[PDB]
Design a protein around this ligand. Sequence first.
Ligand SMILES: CO[C@H]1O[C@H](COS(=O)(=O)O)[C@@H](O[C@@H]2O[C@@H](C(=O)O)[C@@H](O[C@H]3O[C@H](COS(=O)(=O)O)[C@@H](O[C@@H]4O[C@H](C(=O)O)[C@@H](O[C@H]5O[C@H](COS(=O)(=O)O)[C@@H](O)[C@H](O)[C@H]5NS(=O)(=O)O)[C@H](O)[C@H]4O)[C@H](OS(=O)(=O)O)[C@H]3NS(=O)(=O)O)[C@H](O)[C@H]2OS(=O)(=O)O)[C@H](O)[C@H]1NS(=O)(=O)O
Lengths: 517, 104, 104
Amino acid sequence: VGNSSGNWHCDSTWMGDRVITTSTRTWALPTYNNHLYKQISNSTSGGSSNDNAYFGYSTPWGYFDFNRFHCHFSPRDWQRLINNNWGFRPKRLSFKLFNIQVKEVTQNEGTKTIANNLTSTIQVFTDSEYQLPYVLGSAHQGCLPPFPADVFMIPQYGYLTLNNGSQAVGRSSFYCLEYFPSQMLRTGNNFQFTYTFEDVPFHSSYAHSQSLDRLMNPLIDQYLYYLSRTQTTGGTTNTQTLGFSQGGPNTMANQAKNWLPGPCYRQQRVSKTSADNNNSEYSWTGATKYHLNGRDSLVNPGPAMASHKDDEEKFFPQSGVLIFGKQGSEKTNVDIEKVMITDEEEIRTTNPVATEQYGSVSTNLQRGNRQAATADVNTQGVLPGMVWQDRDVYLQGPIWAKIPHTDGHFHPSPLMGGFGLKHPPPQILIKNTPVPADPPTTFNQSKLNSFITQYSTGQVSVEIEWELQKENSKRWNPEIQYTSNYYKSTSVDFAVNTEGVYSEPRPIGTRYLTRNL
Amino acid sequence: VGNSSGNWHCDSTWMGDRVITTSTRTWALPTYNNHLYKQISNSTSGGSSNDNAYFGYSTPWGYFDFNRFHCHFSPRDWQRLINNNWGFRPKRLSFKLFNIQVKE
Amino acid sequence: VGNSSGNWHCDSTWMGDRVITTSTRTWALPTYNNHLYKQISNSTSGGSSNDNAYFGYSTPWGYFDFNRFHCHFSPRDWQRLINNNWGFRPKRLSFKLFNIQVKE
Ligand SMILES: CO[C@H]1O[C@H](COS(=O)(=O)O)[C@@H](O[C@@H]2O[C@@H](C(=O)O)[C@@H](O[C@H]3O[C@H](COS(=O)(=O)O)[C@@H](O[C@@H]4O[C@H](C(=O)O)[C@@H](O[C@H]5O[C@H](COS(=O)(=O)O)[C@@H](O)[C@H](O)[C@H]5NS(=O)(=O)O)[C@H](O)[C@H]4O)[C@H](OS(=O)(=O)O)[C@H]3NS(=O)(=O)O)[C@H](O)[C@H]2OS(=O)(=O)O)[C@H](O)[C@H]1NS(=O)(=O)O
C-alpha cells in the first residue's frame, strides 16, 4: 500500500548486435459490459449486408496490445535502426504490470467522489496455450500510445465465431474467460511475464540496387539464342522465315533469365488527384476482393506488390497499400489530406507493380491462317523460379501476426507486414474483479446485478530484445539515409505542438539502405 | 490489506483415470435476522395444514452449498465425462475462502 | 502341417497417446494369367479414345492392399478417435501372413 511495485524504464540500449527497447506507460481500465458476457451480432450493431454479417461475444475483459512499432521505438531509435541495419527481428519479450490502484467512483448528488479501494483486486491472465481467439494482429486500436507522456485506456476483448448471417451455426463456440486461471492483484502486487520468440526470418530492411531483369554483364553477349525474326524483312513480298539472335547488351529484354518476379493479384489504380479518376462509385465495385463462403471481402492490403512505376507518385493501388491516419483524423469519409498513404515502390526490382498486368501469355496456336494471340495475366500464383520481397514495416504499423492454425500455409509472412509467428506473444487479458453492492437481507436465488462502480489504473512496461543484422555495404558512393529535413519549420517533427499534442507527420518505413540482388 | 489472499482457479484437469474440477466464484453475505436466532414455525410463516406444519430456528449464519454438478463441471467437461466414462465418483475435496472484504 | 502358424488378433488397444489397431482376415489367391505376363493395351480391353489409351502389363502376381481406414478401425473405434482426438498419424506397421494352405 505504501510502497511502489516497480520503476519507470522507458529507454533503448544498443549493444552492437542487438537492441533492447523498454517502454513504460500508464493505463486505465473501466468495467466493460458491466461485468457481463453479451452475445453480439451484425443485427445488434444495427444490421448490415451479408458481407458484413457477424456473430461473436463481448466480454468484460480488456487486453493489452503493444503490437505496433511505435510503442517500442522512438522516432530517433527507429532512424538509428533504419539507417544502419540490414535486417532485424525480435528475440525475447518481457511484460510487467505494476503500481496498481483500484479507484472506486461513487456518484452521489451530482458530486463525483473517487476514492481508492485498497482491498479490491483485478484479474490478469495470459493465454500461453492459445486456447482463446487471437485478436491481436488485426491492426486494431488501443495500443500503448507512441508518446510516453500520455495515458491510455485498455480496449475491450470480444471475439467472433462462425455465423450464417446474424445467426450462430452448430460449430459456433462460446469461450468463458473466467474459466482460465487468472491472478488476482491488489494494490501492492505486480504481474511479471516473460516470452521468447521462435526463430523467424530477419525483416529485410534494405532496398535492392539491381532490378531482377537486369542482372547481366552489359558488356558481354550470351551464348544462347532466341527467335529474333519471323518474317523475311522487306523485298516487297516478305514471307515466313526463322531468324535467331544472341541476347546482347542492346537486347537486354530478349536475353535469357533464370528468375521471375514475385506473384501478383492485380489492383485498381486510383490517383491522389481526384480529377484524374473516373466519376463513379467504384470503391467497392472496382475493388479486388476474395470470396469466402459466399461473402466477399476486400483484399487489403493484399499480397506484396510495388505501388507504381517510375515517375508516377500520384497513383496508388486502391487497396494495395497501408493507409495510416494523421493525428486526430476522424473515422469516416475523411479526405486525403487527413491520411498518409504508404509508398511500396522500393520493391519494383523484384515485385510486379500492383496496378499492372503480371505478364502476357499465348492464348492459341499460331498457324498459316491463325495468327499469334496473347492474353494479359492479372492474377499469377507462384511458380518455380519466382523471387519476391515482403511488405515493409512502418514505425506506425504492426509487428507480428499469429499464423493461423491450419495444415497448410505458403510463406506465412503477414500481408500487412511484420513477422508471422505460430506462437506469437500471448494475449494479456485483464479485468476488474466485481465487487457487489449491499445484498438483500433475505435470500434471493437471483445473481447479484448491483455492483460498486470502480476502475483501475497503474503502469505497464514492455521490454523487447531485437536482434540486428548490421550493414556491411562495400558500395563506394553515399547511401540514402532517413533524415529530418534541415529547413526551418514552425514546429519540430515528431514533437509536441504548442498544446501538448504529439504527432507523427509521416509514415516511416525501413527500406533505406540498398543492397545488390 | 494491500495484498491478495488467493488467485482465480476455475478449470478442469484430465489425468486419464481422474479429473480435477476447480471452480472459483465471488460471493456476498448480508447480515441475517439482524444477528438474532429467531424461532420459526408454520404459524409464523402464515399458518398451514398439518402436513406442512413445522418448528425450527433461523440463525444469523449463511452457508456455502456447492452440491450440484454444474458448480463443478462446465457443459463441455460434462460432455467429455458423459461420452467417455462408464462410472465416476468423487475422491477428495478442497474448499478455500479468500479475498475477504467487509464493506460497511 | 499339423500345427497352426499364428493366432487371430483383431482388436484395438488405446494407450492414451496412441492406438494400436490389429486386423486379421482370411484370403484366397487364384492363379492369374495362368502364370503368364501378358502385355495389355487399350486395344486389348476393346479399344478406346485417346484420353483412355494405355499400355501396360498383367502379371501372375496378386498383392495385398490394406490402404483404407475401415480395414483397421471398426465403426466404434473410428468414433472414439473422431470424437476425442484433434489429430492422428500412423507410426509403425506390422504385416504378418500365416496359416497357408495350397489346395489343388
Ligand atoms: C472453332 O472451331 C472451328 O475452328 C477451329 C480452329 O479455328 S480457331 O482456332 O480460330 O477457333 C477448328 O479447330 C482446329 O482445326 C480442327 C480441324 O480442322 O479438324 C483441328 O485441327 C487439328 O486436327 C485436324 C485433323 O487432324 S487429324 O489427325 O484428325 O486428321 C488437322 O487438320 C487436318 O490436317 C491433316 C494434316 O495436315 O495432316 C489433314 O490430313 C491430310 O494430310 C495427312 C498428311 O498429309 S500427307 O501429305 O499424306 O502426308 C493425311 O494423312 C490425311 O489422310 C489427309 N487428310 S485428307 O482428308 O485432306 O485427305 C486433314 O485433312 C486436315 O483436316 C489440324 O492440322 S492442320 O493440318 O489443319 O494445320 C490439327 N491441328 S494443327 O495441326 O495443330 O493445326 C483442331 O481441333 C484445331 O486445330 S488448331 O490448329 O488448333 O486450330 C475446329 O475444327 C472448327 N470447328 S467448327 O467450328 O465446328 O467448324
